[PDB]
Design an enzyme around this catalytic site. Structure first.
Site, PDB file in Angstrom:
ATOM      1  N   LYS A 145      10.244   9.159  -9.729  1.00  0.00           N
ATOM      2  CA  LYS A 145      10.026   7.714  -9.636  1.00  0.00           C
ATOM      3  C   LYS A 145       9.862   7.277  -8.175  1.00  0.00           C
ATOM      4  O   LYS A 145      10.692   7.553  -7.312  1.00  0.00           O
ATOM      5  CB  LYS A 145      11.205   6.954 -10.290  1.00  0.00           C
ATOM      6  N   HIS A 189      17.094   7.044 -13.437  1.00  0.00           N
ATOM      7  CA  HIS A 189      15.759   7.419 -13.814  1.00  0.00           C
ATOM      8  C   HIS A 189      15.452   8.853 -13.367  1.00  0.00           C
ATOM      9  O   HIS A 189      16.100   9.396 -12.484  1.00  0.00           O
ATOM     10  CB  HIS A 189      14.755   6.408 -13.174  1.00  0.00           C
TER      11      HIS A 189
HETATM   12  N1  LIG Z   1       7.030  -1.571 -17.648  1.00  0.00           N
HETATM   13  C1  LIG Z   1       7.508  -0.488 -18.247  1.00  0.00           C
HETATM   14  O1  LIG Z   1       7.927  -0.547 -19.433  1.00  0.00           O
HETATM   15  C2  LIG Z   1       7.446   0.831 -17.521  1.00  0.00           C
HETATM   16  C3  LIG Z   1       6.977   0.916 -16.227  1.00  0.00           C
HETATM   17  N2  LIG Z   1       6.869   2.072 -15.567  1.00  0.00           N
HETATM   18  C4  LIG Z   1       6.300   2.037 -14.225  1.00  0.00           C
HETATM   19  O2  LIG Z   1       4.897   2.402 -14.418  1.00  0.00           O
HETATM   20  C5  LIG Z   1       4.393   3.159 -13.294  1.00  0.00           C
HETATM   21  C6  LIG Z   1       3.867   4.530 -13.641  1.00  0.00           C
HETATM   22  O3  LIG Z   1       4.911   5.313 -14.227  1.00  0.00           O
HETATM   23  P1  LIG Z   1       4.722   6.830 -14.680  1.00  0.00           P
HETATM   24  O4  LIG Z   1       3.705   6.871 -15.806  1.00  0.00           O
HETATM   25  O5  LIG Z   1       6.055   7.460 -14.700  1.00  0.00           O
HETATM   26  O6  LIG Z   1       4.042   7.379 -13.309  1.00  0.00           O
HETATM   27  P2  LIG Z   1       3.060   8.674 -13.221  1.00  0.00           P
HETATM   28  O7  LIG Z   1       3.050   9.129 -11.810  1.00  0.00           O
HETATM   29  O8  LIG Z   1       3.401   9.653 -14.300  1.00  0.00           O
HETATM   30  O9  LIG Z   1       1.591   8.185 -13.578  1.00  0.00           O
HETATM   31  C7  LIG Z   1       0.868   7.275 -12.743  1.00  0.00           C
HETATM   32  C8  LIG Z   1      -0.612   7.678 -12.904  1.00  0.00           C
HETATM   33  O10 LIG Z   1      -1.420   6.732 -12.207  1.00  0.00           O
HETATM   34  C9  LIG Z   1      -2.465   7.428 -11.609  1.00  0.00           C
HETATM   35  N3  LIG Z   1      -3.062   6.582 -10.576  1.00  0.00           N
HETATM   36  C10 LIG Z   1      -2.696   6.511  -9.283  1.00  0.00           C
HETATM   37  N4  LIG Z   1      -3.492   5.657  -8.613  1.00  0.00           N
HETATM   38  C11 LIG Z   1      -4.353   5.183  -9.486  1.00  0.00           C
HETATM   39  C12 LIG Z   1      -5.455   4.268  -9.396  1.00  0.00           C
HETATM   40  N5  LIG Z   1      -5.706   3.712  -8.217  1.00  0.00           N
HETATM   41  N6  LIG Z   1      -6.143   4.007 -10.531  1.00  0.00           N
HETATM   42  C13 LIG Z   1      -5.876   4.603 -11.708  1.00  0.00           C
HETATM   43  N7  LIG Z   1      -4.875   5.495 -11.859  1.00  0.00           N
HETATM   44  C14 LIG Z   1      -4.094   5.795 -10.790  1.00  0.00           C
HETATM   45  C15 LIG Z   1      -1.773   8.675 -11.114  1.00  0.00           C
HETATM   46  O11 LIG Z   1      -2.701   9.668 -10.751  1.00  0.00           O
HETATM   47  C16 LIG Z   1      -0.934   9.056 -12.300  1.00  0.00           C
HETATM   48  O12 LIG Z   1      -1.619   9.922 -13.235  1.00  0.00           O
HETATM   49  C17 LIG Z   1       5.574   3.218 -12.339  1.00  0.00           C
HETATM   50  O13 LIG Z   1       5.413   2.128 -11.359  1.00  0.00           O
HETATM   51  C18 LIG Z   1       6.817   3.053 -13.196  1.00  0.00           C
HETATM   52  O14 LIG Z   1       7.938   2.510 -12.516  1.00  0.00           O
HETATM   53  C19 LIG Z   1       7.144   3.239 -16.185  1.00  0.00           C
HETATM   54  C20 LIG Z   1       7.625   3.271 -17.493  1.00  0.00           C
HETATM   55  C21 LIG Z   1       7.809   2.092 -18.301  1.00  0.00           C
HETATM   56  O1  LIG Z   2      12.032  -0.807 -14.262  1.00  0.00           O
HETATM   57  C1  LIG Z   2      11.392   0.255 -13.929  1.00  0.00           C
HETATM   58  O2  LIG Z   2      10.986   0.474 -12.745  1.00  0.00           O
HETATM   59  C2  LIG Z   2      11.131   1.327 -14.956  1.00  0.00           C
HETATM   60  C3  LIG Z   2      11.354   1.082 -16.309  1.00  0.00           C
HETATM   61  C4  LIG Z   2      11.107   2.088 -17.219  1.00  0.00           C
HETATM   62  C5  LIG Z   2      10.606   3.331 -16.782  1.00  0.00           C
HETATM   63  C6  LIG Z   2      10.384   3.532 -15.413  1.00  0.00           C
HETATM   64  C7  LIG Z   2       9.933   4.855 -14.881  1.00  0.00           C
HETATM   65  O3  LIG Z   2       9.848   5.902 -15.570  1.00  0.00           O
HETATM   66  O4  LIG Z   2       9.675   4.919 -13.693  1.00  0.00           O
HETATM   67  N1  LIG Z   2      10.644   2.520 -14.559  1.00  0.00           N
END
Ligand SMILES: NC(=O)C1=CN([C@@H]2O[C@H](COP(=O)(O)OP(=O)(O)OC[C@H]3O[C@@H](n4cnc5c(N)ncnc54)[C@H](O)[C@@H]3O)[C@@H](O)[C@H]2O)C=CC1
Ligand SMILES: O=C(O)c1cccc(C(=O)O)n1
Ligand SMILES: NC(=O)C1=CN([C@@H]2O[C@H](COP(=O)(O)OP(=O)(O)OC[C@H]3O[C@@H](n4cnc5c(N)ncnc54)[C@H](O)[C@@H]3O)[C@@H](O)[C@H]2O)C=CC1
Ligand SMILES: NC(=O)C1=CN([C@@H]2O[C@H](COP(=O)(O)OP(=O)(O)OC[C@H]3O[C@@H](n4cnc5c(N)ncnc54)[C@H](O)[C@@H]3O)[C@@H](O)[C@H]2O)C=CC1
Ligand SMILES: NC(=O)C1=CN([C@@H]2O[C@H](COP(=O)(O)OP(=O)(O)OC[C@H]3O[C@@H](n4cnc5c(N)ncnc54)[C@H](O)[C@@H]3O)[C@@H](O)[C@H]2O)C=CC1
Ligand SMILES: O=C(O)c1cccc(C(=O)O)n1
Ligand SMILES: O=C(O)c1cccc(C(=O)O)n1
Ligand SMILES: O=C(O)c1cccc(C(=O)O)n1
Ligand SMILES: [Cl-]
Ligand SMILES: [Cl-]
Ligand SMILES: [Cl-]
Ligand SMILES: [Cl-]
Ligand code: NA
Ligand code: NA
Ligand code: NA
Ligand code: NA
EC number: 1.17.1.8
Lengths: 245, 245, 245, 245
Positions: D137, D133
């Site tokens: 992350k 990743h």
């Molecule tokens: N399930 C899936 O398909 C996927 C899951 N993820 C997961 O999703 C999460 C976020 O990923 P990214 O977008 O890369 O992170 P990121 O850091 O780009 O965005 C997270 C956002 O949440 C905001 N945030 C923080 N605390 C908050 C709160 N209390 N209330 C509202 N907003 C808040 C941050 O300021 C930031 O803008 C991670 O845990 C990642 O592992 C990421 C991609 C796909």
């Molecule tokens: O399984 C995960 O934690 C996951 C899956 C897709 C994107 C991301 C990421 O960008 O952090 N993380």
């Protein structure tokens, strides 16, 4: 012919080496030792050069004997470190005509990989190594991967470390730290010997991957070292200095 | 600042380039043309250097105009061949102060790949290229893969061709023949731009793989060519001659 | 024990099969034939079941003899097509107690790959197969890859074909057309037997990859077919129907 | 339309989600919150369903609020564990009409990967996961990889553990232990989201690999969960139960 002993003659690689030496016209097999065979068989047999594919726990003992006895050594056994190299060098002080070459990988693709990783390293923000090997392997990470990471580290001296925001982690998730390079070790049935060096920067990655599918891939590098071993008195680390690159 | 035009300003890469030029402190955007915009906008705007990311069918026409008008060109558009390079050279005879640089890949990982493939080629019995790109791509095989294969071919001059026992075959199965190097083109939704150079010999393979995940990976190479374009009057093929390797 | 003949006993796979049959407690080796051995050795030896790893040009002749003589057959030789399967079926009409099983891959990982590709196919816009094998291989594309592509094609009946904007192309660049699925064949020293099924849709890809590093990977699937061959009179294509999935 | 809030609206994924919701005809954006926005904006805006892509450290707090307030939740944020799932379930006891779906990966290729790994696991001696990743992350190993390993572990209940002769090791070399499955985490510039499940047995390996090149790959899975969220009161883990497989 040049009289060649093999240590580890019953191992996966050693037995292949025995066949290779036997088959070469210019080389004569003087000894084939495995666990429990005394090392004096080598000296009784008038061995000039030894090929070593044994185990990390015994290789320094074998080297100490070889060097005391003036026997040149081409070592593929892994488990080496800077301190073990210093030690080998220190034994060679007393036997300045004896040549030792130690290489974690004798396959040309792996040698090239290391040379390329060295050249590539300064262009990227991030570098890691993943290595993948059969599940009989004693050591993790592999010798090749450890050497590769040091080369990359050396080449990135004065650049920032790999970026990493990891703030919550299971232990071991991020691999072993080799001079700031994450190194990961897969041990999987079906495998032989494999490595991927990974570099990354904005929007792109570069992967340098090597696969030995068969232990025959180690033979040419070994025979080349065996035939050239006397040109470099002292210690040579890696196959690279015998090649023009 | 140095006055920079972009051809293909609405394309996937061009629009990225527009943003990059606009954002650079030392560069001033003089024109943004897409299909149907007349080229005289470039000369009206006093453009010194043009970045071209258009289409194989139009790029030679664009170059002919640029060169006649003394406008330096940094071209990423593919579809180039030795004959098209000769042609560009022949136009430059008349405009000996005009610099043109044409490169099938501006991403550093792809440049390194080509340089490494060149170094590796003579150590292996076999070499192939597989390239994988998004399914909007006009040309197959890719410019990068075609250039890579020629480099490998050049480097293996005087060695035997790839071994191949194939005696029964579906048409196209073994890829395109580029100077005796099989080249295969995958076109797949989800992809951006990807290539694996594969080398093989007894019991082992070496794979040199590049991935551009984002078109931002082409920006640094382009801006570097744009800023250095006047140092090399005439035609430069590839980014490699602007780098120290 | 069940009396087992091998055709292709001196080949890379056949010789492995001979060793496997010899070593199995419940199986007795009745014949070991290679090129130039008459097929009547099988009937002289009272062979009940034959394992065939020969060549595309001879396998139908072998099958015709086996079937006429009431001898069950487990065939790994490739080069099969729908017409060759119809033909085998038509010979079996006359010998309705004779079982034939023909499979392009006996390794479990390859069987699983085919089953998974079938399940995955309808979720993606794009699908291709790349296969990679040693350069002694007579046929391209491989039997496994051809079967895989047909399965994918079948599963995507009524969906749009793979998108592809290719408008200028070197011949063979886009692979072989197997029921609308591009299939590419790499032939490379160092390789044994390898395949990657690739699926793509918006922003993502799925790759299903199999590697046989050693021909020992074909043994369990073969011995399983040999031991179960009489349960299914007639023709079985693939190993999948002997497995619970 | 169904009133949809987004938490993490300024993040890499959240901002993409905002655009997706806005663009969908049947969905109305009721709130866009990022760090420091009070959660009562959701209730003030009459939000029916929330999409959460925030951070492991805040997601349970968000869920507690959503659930108390009867607001359905589709959560992509990772950092989940069996204990966190039990906790969510325990909060839902009090609000038995509220639906929560939590999934570590919304991309179909990753869902398929998990389903396939589950099916494949019992055929192999060895299984590992490598995930790769971007280096922003927070969590290692990834949620997808952790879930994948548990599935494999569950499926291999009553089989022997992975063979491994490792007797000398750098710390972290062999990855994180997730229910006896080694899991390795690469963090590399250029990457988005990637995983390879690896299985091995005698002479062969099977690799199931997923690549999200773009965060657009998470959109369909999310919108599907959003539109179906009310069908399953209580907690659903993963996207798989909304699919027919
Ligand atoms: N399930 C899936 O398909 C996927 C899951 N993820 C997961 O999703 C999460 C976020 O990923 P990214 O977008 O890369 O992170 P990121 O850091 O780009 O965005 C997270 C956002 O949440 C905001 N945030 C923080 N605390 C908050 C709160 N209390 N209330 C509202 N907003 C808040 C941050 O300021 C930031 O803008 C991670 O845990 C990642 O592992 C990421 C991609 C796909
Ligand atoms: O399984 C995960 O934690 C996951 C899956 C897709 C994107 C991301 C990421 O960008 O952090 N993380
Ligand atoms: N440099 C290279 O190119 C390669 C290096 N290696 C390394 O070589 C070593 C051996 O590898 P394999 O052949 O897989 O191991 P192996 O376990 O198959 O064989 C080692 C053999 O050494 C024997 N042995 C143990 N102690 C001994 C002693 N004191 N004297 C003589 N023989 C002894 C063992 O009984 C065994 O038969 C390992 O350290 C491995 O990492 C392996 C492959 C290639
Ligand atoms: N050298 C490198 O690093 C790279 C090269 N490429 C190559 O660059 C070219 C373009 O790639 P993409 O941006 O994906 O294609 P694209 O189709 O997204 O964009 C091309 C743009 O050019 C415009 N155009 C067409 N004719 C024109 C004309 N006569 N004048 C001005 N504009 C015109 C089109 O309307 C379109 O907007 C391709 O040949 C591709 O192979 C792509 C990526 C990187
Ligand atoms: N289904 C599966 O799992 C696999 C299938 N194959 C296929 O099996 C076939 C053989 O593969 P390899 O062992 O690599 O080839 P190979 O060339 O090593 O061996 C074939 C052997 O058949 C012998 N042969 C030729 N004509 C014969 C005849 N009329 N009667 C008896 N023997 C004869 C040859 O002399 C040779 O020794 C190929 O079609 C290959 O694609 C290979 C590996 C696995
Ligand atoms: O670098 C290493 O440790 C290495 C290299 C090749 C083979 C092996 C092996 O089989 O153990 N180990
Ligand atoms: O070598 C090429 O043709 C190439 C390189 C990078 C991107 C693209 C593209 O997106 O078409 N094409
Ligand atoms: O599908 C095939 O054709 C195939 C499968 C495994 C091995 C081989 C081979 O070695 O030729 N061929
Ligand atoms: Cl080296
Ligand atoms: Cl270049
Ligand atoms: Cl099958
Ligand atoms: Cl799921
Ligand atoms: Na000899
Ligand atoms: Na600017
Ligand atoms: Na037997
Ligand atoms: Na909307």
């Amino acid at each position: 012919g040049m009289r060649v002993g093999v240590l580890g003659a019953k191992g996966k690689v050693g037995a292949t080496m025995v066949r290779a030496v036997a088959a070469a016209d210019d080389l004569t097999l003087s000894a084939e030792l495995d666990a429990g065979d005394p090392l004096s068989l080598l000296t009784d047999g008038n061995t000039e050069v030894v090929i070593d594919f044994t185990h990390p726990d015994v290789v320094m003992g074998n080297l100490e004997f070889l060097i005391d006895n003036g026997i040149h050594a081409v070592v593929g056994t892994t488990g080496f470190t800077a301190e073990r190299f210093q030690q080998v060098e220190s034994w060679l002080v007393a036997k300045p005509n004896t040549s030792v070459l130690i290489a974690p990988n004798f396959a040309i693709g792996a040698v090239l990989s290391m040379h390329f990783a060295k050249q590539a390293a300064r262009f990227f923000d991030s570098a890691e190594v993943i290595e993948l090997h059969h599940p009989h392997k004693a050591d993790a990470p592999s010798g090749t991967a450890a050497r590769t990471a040091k080369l990359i580290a050396e080449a990135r001296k004065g650049l920032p470390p790999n970026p990493d925001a990891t703030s919550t982690s299971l232990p071991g998730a991020r691999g072993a730290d080799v001079d700031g390079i994450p190194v990961h070790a897969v041990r999987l049935a079906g495998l032989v010997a494999h490595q991927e060096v990974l570099f990354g920067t904005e929007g792109e990655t570069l992967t340098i991957r090597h696969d030995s599918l068969d232990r025959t891939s180690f033979v040419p590098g070994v025979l080349l070292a065996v035939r050239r071993i006397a040109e470099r008195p002292g210690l040579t680390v890696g196959l690279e200095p015998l090649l023009d690159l």
